[PDB]
């Protein structure tokens, strides 16, 4: 689970970045 988050957080602050 704590993977997993990560993985989530990243596809989230990726997005939020580009727009």
Known sequence: GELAALKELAA???AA???
């Open 12 to 14: 989230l602050k990726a």
């Open 17 to 19: 970045w580009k727009g």
